[PDB]
Amino acid sequence: TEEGKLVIWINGDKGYNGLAEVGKKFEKDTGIKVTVEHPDKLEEKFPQVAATGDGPDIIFWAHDRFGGYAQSGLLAEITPDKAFQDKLYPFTWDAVRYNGKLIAYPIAVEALSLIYNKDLLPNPPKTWEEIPALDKELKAKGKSALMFNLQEPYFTWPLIAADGGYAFKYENGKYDIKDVGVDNAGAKAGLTFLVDLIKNKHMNADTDYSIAEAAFNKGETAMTINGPWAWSNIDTSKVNYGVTVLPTFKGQPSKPFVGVLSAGINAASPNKELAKEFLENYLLTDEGLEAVNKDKPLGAVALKSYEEELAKDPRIAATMENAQKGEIMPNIPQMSAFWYAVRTAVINAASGRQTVDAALAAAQTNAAAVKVECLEAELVVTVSRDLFGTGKLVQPGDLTLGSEGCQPRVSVDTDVVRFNAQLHECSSRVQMTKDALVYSTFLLHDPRPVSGLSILRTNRVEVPIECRYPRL
Ligand SMILES: OC[C@H]1O[C@H](O[C@H]2[C@H](O)[C@@H](O)[C@@H](O)O[C@@H]2CO)[C@H](O)[C@@H](O)[C@@H]1O
Numbered sequence: 001t002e003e004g005k006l007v008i009w010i011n012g013d014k015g016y017n018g019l020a021e022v023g024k025k026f027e028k029d030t031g032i033k034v035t036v037e038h039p040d041k042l043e044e045k046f047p048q049v050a051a052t053g054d055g056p057d058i059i060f061w062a063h064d065r066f067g068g069y070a071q072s073g074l075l076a077e078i079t080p081d082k083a084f085q086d087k088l089y090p091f092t093w094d095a096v097r098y099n100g101k102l103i104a105y106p107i108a109v110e111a112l113s114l115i116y117n118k119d120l121l122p123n124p125p126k127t128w129e130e131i132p133a134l135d136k137e138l139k140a141k142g143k144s145a146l147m148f149n150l151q152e153p154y155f156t157w158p159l160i161a162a163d164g165g166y167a168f169k170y171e172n173g174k175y176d177i178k179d180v181g182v183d184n185a186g187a188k189a190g191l192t193f194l195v196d197l198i199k200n201k202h203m204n205a206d207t208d209y210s211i212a213e214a215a216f217n218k219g220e221t222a223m224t225i226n227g228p229w230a231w232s233n234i235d236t237s238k239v240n241y242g243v244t245v246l247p248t249f250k251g252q253p254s255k256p257f258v259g260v261l262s263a264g265i266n267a268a269s270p271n272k273e274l275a276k277e278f279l280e281n282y283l284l285t286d287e288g289l290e291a292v293n294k295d296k297p298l299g300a301v302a303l304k305s306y307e308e309e310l311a312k313d314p315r316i317a318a319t320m321e322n323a324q325k326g327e328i329m330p331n332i333p334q335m336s337a338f339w340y341a342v343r344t345a346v347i348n349a350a351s352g353r354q355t356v357d358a359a360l361a362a363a364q365t366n367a368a369a370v371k372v373e374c375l376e377a378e379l380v381v382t383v384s385r386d387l388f389g390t391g392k393l394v395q396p397g398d399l400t401l402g403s404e405g406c407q408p409r410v411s412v413d414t415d416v417v418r419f420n421a422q423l424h425e426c427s428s429r430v431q432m433t434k435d436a437l438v439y440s441t442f443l444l445h446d447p448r449p450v451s452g453l454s455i456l457r458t459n460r461v462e463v464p465i466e467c468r469y470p471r472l
């Protein structure tokens with residue numbers, strides 16, 4: 001990274017052009033150039049380049065990633081005076097605190113809502129259970145009831161959590177990273193409902209963000225599920241849409257994960273002063289947040305003034321109604337593992353490649369004990385040796401990645417076994433989606449032969465190991 005300027009990363013669905021306007025104001029006033037970029041997979045690339053001392057000066061993402069970044073020494077501690085803290089809501093500062101330190105600036109509060117075409121559907125269904133029958137009606141006139149992104153677990157999690165799914169159990173003031181709530185009866189019920197919607201052809205397992213967005217904004221489907229950033233494009237489509245409560249499932253509300261868009265400062269930036277100035281006195285103002293929101297709505301911004309100004313907007317009100325019914329995302333480093341786990345499970349259940357029960361059990365194991373890192377042509381799998389929480393440590397020789405042709409390098413620590421594998425050699429399965437090439441294999445723990453009687457929790461366990469790379 002180079003000093004005298006600022007490089008900013010932010011996701012491509014956010015208002016990066018408005019942010020660039022803020023940067024242009026900054027530049028004119030101070031002479032310091034600001035370059036805003038939106039690389040794909042930036043939440044995964046940032047730790048890779050920041051660990052070598054490179055990467056952007058500022059990284060934007062929902063707060064849930066930042067704990068990992070902070071645990072890895074990648075984030076500078078931020079030091080706002082008391083007055084600036086008084087300018088933002090306490091909930092948001094809470095979201096960006098890790099081990100008693102502030103590790104990023106809160107920007108805005110995000111939550112999914114149900115977005116619906118008022119002309120096609122004047123009265124949105126209050127329950128998921130209605131949607132199959134409703135779909136029938138709409139299918140009779142060449143339309144669908146619901147389409148939304150099924151490739152990212154962020155969008156399916158509300159249904160999964162409604163009847164009792166959860167990420168990590170919060171207990172005694174801390175999250176128990178071995179107590180994952182993706183494999184309980186409620187999560188299984190929610191995912192079964194989703195997979196049923198697919199099997200009965202009310203939804204297609206391949207639908208992604210762009211497909212669902214195009215369908216809804218063209219008037220081909222009566223509903224979608226999305227956050228404030230999407231509203232802009234809908235406005236341009238001139239569809240007459242409303243933003244409202246997500247449907248219930250078995251009488252309980254959908255529970256979306258509440259995100260807080262946050263901006264962290266790279267620990268290796270030589271421009272930490274400039275970054276603080278830009279964030280506090282340029283972006284986190286009525287003018288800055290106004291520009292960014294005008295591009296792609298931010299939601300309920302953390303700055304009290306502009307949030308009070310925008311609360312009249314009923315869409316913000318529905319976003320916050322849904323947020324209240326949901327849970328704030330943890331920011332612990334294990335969230336990435338959680339997300340990988342659920343992602344894989346959902347896809348594999350939606351395709352029918354795996355049952356719901358098996359997919360969610362494997363996701364429990366993956367979130368609790370496995371970390372997948374996908375590199376150019378190589379894969380790294382890190383397995384917790386305390387695989388079942390018993391405190392009994394697995395031996396490396398009982399762990400196998402892939403089939404016999406897969407011959408990884410295996411390294412052992414006190415607490416983990418790490419597999420460094422060649423993707424071509426270890427891919428059991430390859431396939432293409434619209435947007436990605438997918439390489440897939442499995443991790444197996446099989447201690448047999450073992451002399452003792454196997455009882456209760458089984459010692460044989462198999463989890464999906466998968467990497468997705470953009471098609472270009
Ligand atoms: O799907 C897993 C993904 O969910 C969240 O990402 C959201 C993000 O919060 C929103 O700002 C918007 O970009 O949609 C994203 C999902 O595509 C988590 O914050 C992220 O860590 C997680 O991977």
Ligand SMILES: [Ca+2]
Binds near residue numbers: 179181183184364
């Ligand atoms: Ca569990």
Ligand SMILES: [Ca+2]
Binds near residue numbers: 210
């Ligand atoms: Ca696409």
Ligand SMILES: [Ca+2]
Binds near residue numbers: 293295296
């Ligand atoms: Ca706009």
